[PDB]
């Protein structure tokens, strides 16, 4: 149909249609534009006017300008042909390697899998990261969440997971860049090309890329997550394959939404956010799941505004995950990396019937001594450790050794740690912490446990220290 | 030897403990003033949102 822009306010554009008003979620096409400018119908204002959200900048738009109804929501290219390419919210290619020829085009708007489609197979996903594997194990086909304040370690943790999980993976991988750093997209792209995971010649690429970084207007950042998820949906279903979905950073979806929600005319909810925050988030995260038809292991980085974990965004995401890895600025500052909070990172898999009694018990022992130490922190603070019970000194000492043994040198982080990357097998992780708990290394200096792999290196570093 | 040592030690211990308390006071004051400001702001924005929604 043919409509006319009757109002433009940043990313929100109102279009008036004489006949055949376009339904909600329908992608409209602005006419008289060099590049494709899509407007998604968000609501029907009445008087034959619809309120929409632009997927690109609205500069240059004039009142009266013509808009066509495409007849359907934003549809993108889905299929193997997306592997090794990079697209934007609206599915166009942004790698300068020409068109994306697919048979199928899926809409980025799909209803979530039904309750009868849900899977319930609990299976551990060993990452080789001591802290995660011990305290809050990830699961295959489960939902993993990396929480973190600015600069704390989310992106390095995701890249380390890609390196450990994705590499040794039989299946396709989808990486959605959402409101983050374009230059990280370029690094990712070239890193993937160099490794051979993105082959620009053979048809052997295993990763599909989708980006909408911090350089995009709100409307595009609010939908890129849906775009890369739609690509992951196909591989999951239309191919019955184990898909991996990495998103950095999913918070940017919610933040994109607050920016337009104001322009959409809604009364603001707590902290200035859109009153639809949780439902917007829900209809999207419910699509990011494993189904009986296929499995998707998702890893989403989640930005924590002002480091406040109670902020509506991060707070609402907790219920969408099966395992959480919560990163702390204070932990990072102590030099511990990855800066995981051992007392705030949880997992539904952390059950004696799943990870077994030996693993469950050591994890619980580690957390008990960390919590007990945490209690003494205040007392240590004022009077130091000399007016401390000989009994408590020992908890403190072990805790500090456990606290340092939780740290690990990552490949991706080699330049910052000054240490070779390590990948520790679950069995070795359990043993290391068992032994420290048992007081077997009450004679080694804490420092020996810092930045190593298996406990064996701790001992070897202790001798090195003389 | 005992009395000298003990007093040296105690002097040291209390000197350090008052220093630690000082730093903790400074840090708590900062937190107090961040919270005091966020509270003012937060209460005010509730008033405006309510007012504006009429």
């Amino acid at each position: 149909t043919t409509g006319r822009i009757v109002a433009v306010i940043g990313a929100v554009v109102d279009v008036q249609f004489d006949e055949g008003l376009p339904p909600i979620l329908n992608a409209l096409e602005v006419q008289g534009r060099e590049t494709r400018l899509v407007l998604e119908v968000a609501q029907h204002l009445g008087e034959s006017t619809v309120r929409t959200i632009a997927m690109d900048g609205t500069e240059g738009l004039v009142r009266g300008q013509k808009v066509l109804d495409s007849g359907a929501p934003i549809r993108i290219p889905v299929g193997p042909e997306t592997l090794g390419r990079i697209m934007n919210v609206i599915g166009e290619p942004i790698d300068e390697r020409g068109p994306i020829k697919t048979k199928q085009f899926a809409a980025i708007h799909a209803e979530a899998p039904e309750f009868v489609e849900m899977s319930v197979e609990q299976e551990i996903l060993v990452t080789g990261i001591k802290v995660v594997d011990l305290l809050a194990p990830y699961a295959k086909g489960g939902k993993i969440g990396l929480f973190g304040g600015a600069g704390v370690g989310k992106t390095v943790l995701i890249m380390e997971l890609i390196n450990n999980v994705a590499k040794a993976h039989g299946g396709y991988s989808v990486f959605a860049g959402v409101g983050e750093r374009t230059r990280e997209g370029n690094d990712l792209y070239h890193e993937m090309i160099e490794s051979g995971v993105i082959n620009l010649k053979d048809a052997t690429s295993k990763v599909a890329l989708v980006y909408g970084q911090m350089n995009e207007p709100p409307g595009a950042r609010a939908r890129v997550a849906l775009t890369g998820l739609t690509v992951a949906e196909y591989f999951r279903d239309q191919e019955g394959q184990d898909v991996l979905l990495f998103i950095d950073n999913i918070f940017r979806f919610t933040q994109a939404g607050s920016e337009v929600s104001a322009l959409l005319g809604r009364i603001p909810s707590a902290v200035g956010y859109q009153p639809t925050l949780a439902t917007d988030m829900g209809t999207m995260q419910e699509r990011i799941t494993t189904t009986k038809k296929g499995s998707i292991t998702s890893v989403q980085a989640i930005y924590v505004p002002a480091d406040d974990l109670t902020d509506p965004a991060p707070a609402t995401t907790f219920a969408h995950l099966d395992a959480t890895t919560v990163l702390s600025r204070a932990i990072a500052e102590l030099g511990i990396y990855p800066a995981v909070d051992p007392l705030d990172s949880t997992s539904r898999i952390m059950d004696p019937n799943i990870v077994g009694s030996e693993h469950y018990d050591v994890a619980r022992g580690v957390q008990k001594i960390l919590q007990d130490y945490k209690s003494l922190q205040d007392i240590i603070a004022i009077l130091g450790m000399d007016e401390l019970s000989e009994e408590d000194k020992l908890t403190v000492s072990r805790a500090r050794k456990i606290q340092r043994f939780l740290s690990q040198p990552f490949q991706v982080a080699e330049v910052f740690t000054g240490h070779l990357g390590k990948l520790v097998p679950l069995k070795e992780t359990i043993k290391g912490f068992q032994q420290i708990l048992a007081g077997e290394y009450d004679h080694l200096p804490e420092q020996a446990f810092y930045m190593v792999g298996p406990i064996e290196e701790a001992v070897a570093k202790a001798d090195k220290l003389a | 030897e005992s009395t000298t040592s003990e007093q040296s030690a105690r002097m040291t211990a209390m000197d350090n403990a008052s220093k630690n308390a000082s730093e903790m006071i400074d840090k708590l004051t900062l937190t107090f003033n961040r919270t005091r400001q966020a509270v003012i702001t937060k209460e005010l924005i509730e008033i405006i949102s309510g007012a504006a929604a009429l």
């Binding site: 009077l383 007016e387 | 003990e6 105690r10 211990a13």
Partner: peptide, 14 residues
Amino acid sequence: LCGAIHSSVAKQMK
């Protein structure tokens, strides 16, 4: 609150 006076002597004494 004598710093670590007491602890030292007691440990080496027993």
